Amino acid sequence: IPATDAVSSATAGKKMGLQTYSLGQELLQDMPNGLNRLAKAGYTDLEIFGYREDTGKFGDYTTFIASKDYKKMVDDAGLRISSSHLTPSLREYTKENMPKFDEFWKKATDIHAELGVSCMVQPSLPRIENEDDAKVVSEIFNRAGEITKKAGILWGYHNHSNEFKRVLKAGEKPEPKGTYIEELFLKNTDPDKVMFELDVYWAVMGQQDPVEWMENYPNRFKLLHIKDRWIIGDSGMMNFPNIFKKAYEIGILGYYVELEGDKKGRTQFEGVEKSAAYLQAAPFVK
């Protein structure tokens, strides 16, 4: 399985992940061949989606796949499912509901241990209107992470942009004031229970320097999502040389590429392949 950035038959491919939600139906409609395509482009790792808490199976948004069959398909293609995005159906993040969230995470961990993932990540922000809401959410995240860690799996949280809104304390006189939501989650979660999958793109879209966040919480951001307008490295917006330099400094465990739907009529496979080509050729990507 040749590395694309070096001709030598001893050069390992760069380790590179993809969030498969990027491909939607293009992958699901022909998975063996699609997986081979991803492997040919240099992807080594997948972060999946679609876990259903009632059945314990994975599906898009008729048919659902069990962990064993999922793992087999991906393994046969020379890939590994190393992460998974999942969110409880329960939307009420209250102290009273903490045992219900535990039940979700316990069952999900059992299924994901079968799947053989290293990480389980929640990518969905609860309602946060003040600090207290963020603290209760953080307590629930802690409990989730303790549960996953029993199986040797890292629990993490994936941000978009709204985590870079500020919230005040309950009772705090309004008028910048308040604390970033992301900051509150960091400060109120245990590093041994909870890590963060830093979305560098949605951080920039929230007016943040992702390198600054990485520098301030170096042991907490253990994964990145690598995202751009579309094709990674094709826009005016993101400084991937600096993001990757800081990532290696802080010791990230890995990253997953994601693309949203194209606006110019192209396939997701194209964007995913061209993203891979950039990262594979980039000398700042290890």
Q: How many CA atoms lie within 13 A of 284 on its CB side?
A: 12
Q: How many domains does the chain have?
A: 1
Closest-CA residue to 227 (of 265, 269, 263, 199):
199
CB within 8 Å of 233: residues ≥ 6 apart: 240, 275, 278, 279, 282
Distance CA 224, CA 258 (A): 10
Tokens describing residue 137: 């959410």
Number of continuous H segments (helices) and E segments (strands) in the chain:
10, 10
Closest-CA residue to 48 (of 40, 62, 57, 58):
58
Distance CA 229, CA 217 (A): 26
Distance CA 105, CA 153 (A): 12
Which method, experimentally, gave rise to this model? X-ray
Closest-CA residue to 162 (of 145, 144, 137):
137
Tokens describing residue 92: 């009420």
Query: At 156, phi and psi to the nearest 5?
Result: -140, 170
Look up the domain containing 250 and give its range. 1-286
CATH number for the domain including 25?
Answer: 3.20.20.150
Asked if 111 and 89 count as a contact pair (C-beta separation under 8 A), the reply is no
Query: At 83, phi and psi to the nearest 5?
Result: -145, 170
Measured in angstroms, the resolution is 1.7
Distance CA 254, CA 257 (A): 10
- Residue 265: other Cβ atoms inside 10 A: 5
